[PDB]
Amino acid sequence: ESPKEHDPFTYDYQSLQIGGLVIAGILFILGILIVLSRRCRCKFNQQQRTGEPDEEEGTFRSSIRRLSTRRR
Q1: Which CATH number covers residue 71?
Q2: Cα separation of 52 and 43, whole Å?
Q3: Breaks in the chain, named by the residue before each, with C–N above 2.5 Å?
Q4: How far apart are the first and last CA of the chain?
């Protein structure tokens, strides 16, 4: 019989089997969170939208932009 074929042992792609799957999912997962997150920026500013602050996040992500230039 060939019961080993069922297991990854027969394949040397032991690490490459889940690899692509995990990283790909992280991009899209970050993707979904990121997409919805953008709404927080517009939803936070009452001036931009009638909606009132929410998620308690606010211009929190904006603080990260500082990370781009940081010190003068």
Answers
A1: 1.20.5.780
A2: 7
A3: none
A4: 69
Cα separations in angstroms, 17 against 6, 11, 23: 13, 9, 11
Long-range contacts of 61-70, Cβ-Cβ distance < 8 Å, separation of 24 or more: 61/37
Method by which the model was determined: NMR
The pair phi, psi for residue 56, each rounded to 5°, is 55, 5
Among residues 30, 51, 31, which one has the least CA distance to residue 40? 51
Considering its fold, how many domains does the chain have in total? 1
Domain, as residue range, for 50: 1-72
Distances (CA, A) of 9 to 6, 42, 57, 65: 8, 51, 47, 46
Taking the C-alpha atoms of residue 54 and residue 62, their distance in angstroms, rounded to an integer, is 15
